[PDB]
Amino acid sequence: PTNLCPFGEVFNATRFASVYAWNRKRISNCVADYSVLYNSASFSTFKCYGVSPTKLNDLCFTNVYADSFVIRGDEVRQIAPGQTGKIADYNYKLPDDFTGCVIAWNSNNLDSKVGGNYNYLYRLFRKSNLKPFERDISTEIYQAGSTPCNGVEGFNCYFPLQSYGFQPTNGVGYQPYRVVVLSFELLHAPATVC
Amino acid sequence: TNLCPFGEVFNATRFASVYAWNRKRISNCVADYSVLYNSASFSTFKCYGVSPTKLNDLCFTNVYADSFVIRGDEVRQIAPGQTGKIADYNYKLPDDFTGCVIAWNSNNLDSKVGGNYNYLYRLFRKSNLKPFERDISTEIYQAGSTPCNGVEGFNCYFPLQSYGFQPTNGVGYQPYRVVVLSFELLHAPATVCGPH
Amino acid sequence: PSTTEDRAKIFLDNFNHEAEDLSYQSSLASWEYNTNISDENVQKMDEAGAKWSAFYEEQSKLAKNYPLEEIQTVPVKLQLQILQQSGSPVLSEDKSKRLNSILNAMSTIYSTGKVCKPNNPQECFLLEPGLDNIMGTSKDYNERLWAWEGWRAEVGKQLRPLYEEYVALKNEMARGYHYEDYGDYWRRDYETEESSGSGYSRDQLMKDVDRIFTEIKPLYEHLHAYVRTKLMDTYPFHISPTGCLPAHLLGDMWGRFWTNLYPLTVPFGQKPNIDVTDAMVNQGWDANRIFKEAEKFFVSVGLPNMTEGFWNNSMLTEPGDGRKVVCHPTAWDLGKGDFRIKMCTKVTMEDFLTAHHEMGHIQYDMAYATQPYLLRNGANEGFHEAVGEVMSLSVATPKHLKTMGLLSPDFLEDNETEINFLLKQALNIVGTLPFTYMLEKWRWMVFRGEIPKEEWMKKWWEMKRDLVGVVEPVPHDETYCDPASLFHVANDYSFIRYYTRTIFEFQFHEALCRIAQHDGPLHKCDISNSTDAGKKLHQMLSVGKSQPWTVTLKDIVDSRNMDVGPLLRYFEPLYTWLQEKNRKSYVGWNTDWSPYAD
Amino acid sequence: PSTTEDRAKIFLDNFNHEAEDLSYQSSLASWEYNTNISDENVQKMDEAGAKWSAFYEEQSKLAKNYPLEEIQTVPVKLQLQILQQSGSPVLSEDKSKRLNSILNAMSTIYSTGKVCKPNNPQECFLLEPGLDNIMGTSKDYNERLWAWEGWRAEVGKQLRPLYEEYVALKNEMARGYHYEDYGDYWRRDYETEESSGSGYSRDQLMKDVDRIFTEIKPLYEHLHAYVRTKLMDTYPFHISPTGCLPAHLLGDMWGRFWTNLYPLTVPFGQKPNIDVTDAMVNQGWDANRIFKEAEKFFVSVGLPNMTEGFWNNSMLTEPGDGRKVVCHPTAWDLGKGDFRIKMCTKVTMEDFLTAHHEMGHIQYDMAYATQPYLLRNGANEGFHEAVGEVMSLSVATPKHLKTMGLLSPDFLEDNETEINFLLKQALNIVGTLPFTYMLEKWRWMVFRGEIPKEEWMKKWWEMKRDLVGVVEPVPHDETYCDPASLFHVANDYSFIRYYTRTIFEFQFHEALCRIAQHDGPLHKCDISNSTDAGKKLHQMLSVGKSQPWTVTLKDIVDSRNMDVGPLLRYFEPLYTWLQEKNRKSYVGWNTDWSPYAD
């Protein structure tokens, strides 16, 4: 198969999803050379936890998952196995055992505007830490204390998701970074994504 | 020829308040009346009696001089048959009056800044004064039905009130000094002479 | 057997002989403050005023024993009524304490206010010294607008709450005075109820004044319609041809006086204007000469010449720096023959007219001094400054000036000069009548409760648009306080003196002039050397407030009512000429033109 | 399992992630006005600040539900202590409005104040452009005195009523926060309640500062004795050897700083006084070079280099005609990783030093960002400016300049040059310590009630004579309010910061040099290129106010108390030389000598 993988549609995507609603763009028989992505070398962070991208010459797999979302620069450290913070616990959690690449680059130019771009969101409070690749879009008001939340913000009832504040003048850490996470899965079923 | 001592009366540096008017009896002098008129400093110098020029020759039994201090407006009351608060209640000349009345402005010495309240007058009385009667009674006057408990109060007013004299006041309200000569003839031989 | 009447006369006798001097001391202390301002003299003046005030109230409580109904007739009756109405003991002590702080707070706020340039915060201007010069003189639309909005905004917003509190407390004070509403209390002064059933009522004043406004509205309407065409040339795109004028452009901060619009709207520019200031200066005329000529004018009609006390005692010239003084001209009736005039006189035409005017105040005081103490306050609030304006009117005429020696006989008095003269006169005299009426009606109405708090400004401008034809350049909501911006409003002063202040001068001039057999036009009237006019005038002045003002007026003009017929007759030549010029232009307002709504 | 601690952690968690951005919007809006002064931008700043204030009050009120007592470990209870304290539930609304009006009024009076020459009334000078120039540079006794007395008289007399009311209201406001007096409230910054028994108390600060003054008095007294001898030569007949110096003669409006007297009192008026402005210009140094070299210095010690945001967004150069700005140097921590410096840089030596000093503020700013929002204030009142000035000390040394290339390497550093350097520094550094201490002592006493209002002025100058050795040129009665004449007093600012700043400045400098293993005199120490010193500094800088300030101090300098031992050690060479120069002249002062007393 000479077909090339839509990575371009993912990485170059004009619009990116917020971290809690991370878009998983399934890879379907989308044979691409992984060499050219590192060869582009425009990326701020390109760490593969698993095997070398160079070593990916002749490996083809059942399914490859690409997760795309937007987070703060400081939070990039959290997008790694065994890391903890607000993002890894409550929004997007990589597995302890990771055999995939994690990609991130600075997004300030397109994701932040003068006066504030509040469109990107994160989940601040949750009852329990997320399992690997678990996604929670619940808009349920958070019960801090015993008293019951009537769905209205108030004392010990805080809304779980809160808006990211991105502005051009922010520091490198608070600058939005766009993230793309790759996953590779091999199964007893026939391997198809080369 | 004991030249009369009028100067002491007219030139006196202290004059009593109107209600307590001083009578300074003048007896056994030769009295020149020319000097009073030719001094001609006085605001008011009218003899209602006889002409001053004509009375130099006449010789009188006794001559009394009355002196007091009053307001300018009140000067017109010092005349026979005139009526007002001064003439009714302080000093009343007789209807049949035959004498000179002299008055002059006293502002220079009888008024001081802040008020010379030392001059007094009688504001209320039960009955009007008789001619040449002086009433120094300090008795409280009862305007209304209720009597004097001997104390000032409602409808019990103090008869005497203080003249308030100040340098800036108007000519009418300026204090004026008054001197009244009175002339009397009697069966006993007359001795208060002039240049007969 | 002393009837309660008979007793009351005795009490008043005691009051007159005690109170005359004590009032004198308060008058003298206040006079000393104005002529030698210092904090010590302020304290002395306040102390003496306190003595007189406490005494007056004690006399009020004593006065209450004799009841008016048992009293028979008639000034003594009237004297007691003035005495009984103490003055201030009706409001709870706590409420009195809040009220005085409110009153002084607004007075200071008005006096202390200053306004900055928008982009230049360091540059600051005050109204009384500096903004007045800006408002009168400017031709620039935008500068005038910024000053007007800034003053009404910056000072006003601070005052819009305090006025609300002031209304309630003053209303309670009046309701405690058995004077409902408080606006009602102010109109107390006119009414002479004891006129044997035919007494003026205070509610009636509003009816009379309203009738006056409709009677006056044609002249005002034509005068304005002429002015807006004249103003349109200067500010070409900012005045609407059919719309009411904007507030700022009227010639002073609020539009009370249009005299400063005379250069803009002068009908005949090339014809020579009348100023004798230089002739006065060139002739070696000093302030003493100004007042001596003034006294001579009053001597001619038969009124008495100034007292010796008057000359030595008054402050007619600014001392310099023997002391600091308040420069405002004031006429004093201090008491027992101290009649003084205080002015920082300059050898100018303005001060000559003003001096002639002030001496009228003194002449009134001097004539009615014979009457009992409490009946010495003119005849109504509007009689006094009215009499003064009469004397100024007779003197200002050119005929008088030629005889004076200030004007060359060879001044040609034609159609053009007199019509122009009357126009300046209309801007000052007629222009202020609807403003004054509207301002007051607003205060009277607010006191009545006819206007809710939250519509104050809205209603204010509605009235201004409908009644005065003046429009806001920028919308004002309900945190700004524009009515308070006027000095008379900010410091509790009755403003109706000015509306009736006019209705008098003329009604009186017309007569005096008719009595002097002046054959000619009304505005050229000069009553000098006419003793007969002096005697009729003297009869009115001596009465003071002894009689009900209706009767005193009737003796002069054979009528018991405010009549504006004479005012309109004074302005009839200008009136006809105005109609001729306004044929080709719109006359009348449309109530809703706004500069901002394009 | 929902304990109050855990619930509180959730509350602050929400607050941190919510409030960070809003504080940012207020900070950026604030930046816009300072960089683009206009009325519009001012209104934007006030509005954004208004949202921040309202939000802050809501979160604090809400914070009161979580109580400190139940709270356990450990910054969270400090965070809560800051938050629960809310500013404004504490004064009556009327008093709040009156007080704020007073406070703004004093600031305007001071900023707008101007004083006229007695020869010409309209020619007037303001403190900021002109009076500072006269007092700083002039030598004439009477001209200097005229400016001093005029400013203290014209500005002070107006301020006195405002200060009395200001004191009463400020104490009542302070008590509402359950602080004994207003001085107590200001003290509260130093207070350390995080120690079980070893906490710093609000009463203790005074005792520490007072003890410091006694320790410093030998050096100051010797500096004073030397200065007055030098001054006697310049002003032949107005200075007494046994008397204290006059207030005007110290080199500025109140005598706070003696730096401008260096030309009068230079020890060796022949040796050159090092200035590299000309050398900097000759090598083509641009403002960018100044800041790049500064970044290099901090990089050398081991601290991180500047953010990209710093370079692109900050105002390092005077904007020019495009914008309009106040040039005072400021270090800005907008937040959200945005650190800026606003300076109108000039190619001069002083601006090079100021650049390092301001950049130190930024280095601290980047360091404490990691800890929670409320713990980013810095560790003490004086820690910030202490850090900056400490950095300036290392750079000012000739060795650093020689490495820069601004000085030829064989330029001689002898005893005389060093003594000159230490004298110039001593005038600025040591001269201000008793002016500052005495000032705050006076204000603290007044707030306590220790000073009666009627004896304000008399006590003030006594202290000035006793504690600072400055004498009034003219007797000042109690209407004058001289303390308010200083800007900091008039605008309600704590003045003790500068006093503690000097003590933490040399304290830090000594420790860091000791870690840099620099063996020599303290003032020649340059901490450049020393990673170890940088790392100790980094450990302290990151902490901010998370820890009690005493503990952070102990980690830097191995002690928990304010120690002037380092300050005195720094100036010891000049101190010894001072003793040598003084001993032929009187040292000390007799308090009751006054110029007016002949």
Ligand SMILES: *[C@@H]1O[C@H](CO)[C@@H](O)[C@H](O)[C@H]1NC(C)=O
């Ligand atoms: C009062 O003194 C004057 C001054 O000499 C004198 O001429 C006059 O005669 C005196 N009066 C009388 C009544 O003698």
Ligand SMILES: *[C@@H]1O[C@H](CO)[C@@H](O)[C@H](O)[C@H]1NC(C)=O
């Ligand atoms: C003005 O007031 C001062 C205050 O002491 C006083 O001494 C002075 O006499 C007064 N001037 C006049 C003319 O009364």
Ligand SMILES: *[C@@H]1O[C@H](CO)[C@@H](O)[C@H](O)[C@H]1NC(C)=O
């Ligand atoms: C001024 O009035 C008095 C009245 O006593 C009179 O005698 C005098 O002639 C008058 N003066 C003039 C110039 O008419």
Ligand SMILES: *[C@@H]1O[C@H](CO)[C@@H](O)[C@H](O)[C@H]1NC(C)=O
């Ligand atoms: C400076 O202020 C003006 C005020 O209108 C504004 O238009 C401009 O955008 C501001 N400059 C910047 C760089 O924001």
